[PDB]
Design a protein around this ligand. Structure first.
Ligand code: HEM
Ligand code: HEM
Lengths: 149, 149
């Protein structure tokens, strides 16, 4: 269950390893993985489309995927998660960046804090649906991405 | 000849239109474009290779191109030049971003500034060889990338 508030027990050594195993295949193809994930989240959540100005005009899966702006945006969203997994052994480091990234969303991108957990699930489902460990990493990211609000 | 110091005359309207016409084709396939340019720079400029710590172990086009790191790095570079062509009508914003990038290069990445113009040339020969207009933009960017040095 991915949350964006409250507390989440630390990540066991066992969980971390699994996460790295599942994420590797996905990331090795981040250009595609990021897109498909972002686009699905987009299309499946109409209420959160007004927060992607550079996407305006496009609404169908076909369009989105051919858009360079949709691609560049997907690649950054995905790498932000990669940086997270590659830093599960440093909570102080992970939190600082995500607190920074939280600031941009709240202060600059002005995105609704309620869609982070939604996109996160669209990531957990693709990376390893059902993994309590991965949903735990997400809960950590979502909690951080709301720290600025 | 691209330069990285002093100054250069503003880009005329004609030059801006020429630049945006030659750029579109290249940026359209940026995931591929960037990677081609980067590898061409890297492989052809030995001394500058030590400045790419994450490519530790790769020195051939084949190994490079098939790397997530090399591409992510290339995608970010090519996209910074894109922001630049996108801001030809607002040199202020262009400079703000480029100055920030300059600081990152001189502080975190510890990169020798002599190479900005060389990588810029690789981009010039790829987008529009010989075009004085584009060369000027590259000069503008390099002068800006060295401002924090
Ligand atoms: C899984 C959680 C998310 C992560 C890890 C994430 C990560 C990122 C990253 C790395 C950037 C790059 C910012 C930069 O270049 O400085 C970004 C940009 C952006 N994100 Fe998120 N994001 C997430 C969820 C969301 C959600 C739910 C929305 C929509 C409500 C959203 C909307 C945006 C917007 C508007 C931009 C700016 C695009 C631009 O103007 O270039 N993000 N995000
Ligand atoms: C046209 C010239 C150049 C542009 C526009 C450019 C742009 C960029 C951008 C946008 C980043 C992303 C930083 C971030 O993620 O916040 C970056 C990182 C980096 N650049 Fe450059 N760059 C240029 C030339 C060079 C040159 C000549 C070298 C090598 C001598 C170089 C070495 C690096 C390194 C080592 C990093 C850090 C990579 C990492 O650890 O992720 N760059 N550059």
């Amino acid at each position: 269950p991915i949350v964006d508030s409250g507390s989440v027990a630390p990540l066991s050594a066992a969980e971390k390893t699994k996460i790295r195993s599942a994420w590797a295949p996905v990331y090795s193809n981040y250009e595609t993985s990021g897109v498909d994930i972002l686009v699905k989240f987009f299309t499946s959540t109409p209420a959160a489309q007004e927060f992607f100005p550079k996407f305006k005009g496009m609404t169908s899966a076909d369009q989105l995927k051919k858009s360079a702006d949709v691609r560049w945006h997907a690649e950054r969203i995905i790498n932000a998660v990669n940086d997270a997994v590659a830093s599960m052994d440093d909570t102080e480091k992970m939190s600082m960046k995500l607190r920074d990234l939280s600031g941009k969303h709240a202060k600059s991108f002005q995105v609704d804090p309620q869609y982070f957990k939604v996109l996160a699930a669209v990531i957990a489902d693709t990376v390893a649906a059902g993994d309590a460990g991965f949903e735990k990493l997400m809960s950590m990211i979502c909690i951080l991405l709301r720290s600025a609000y």
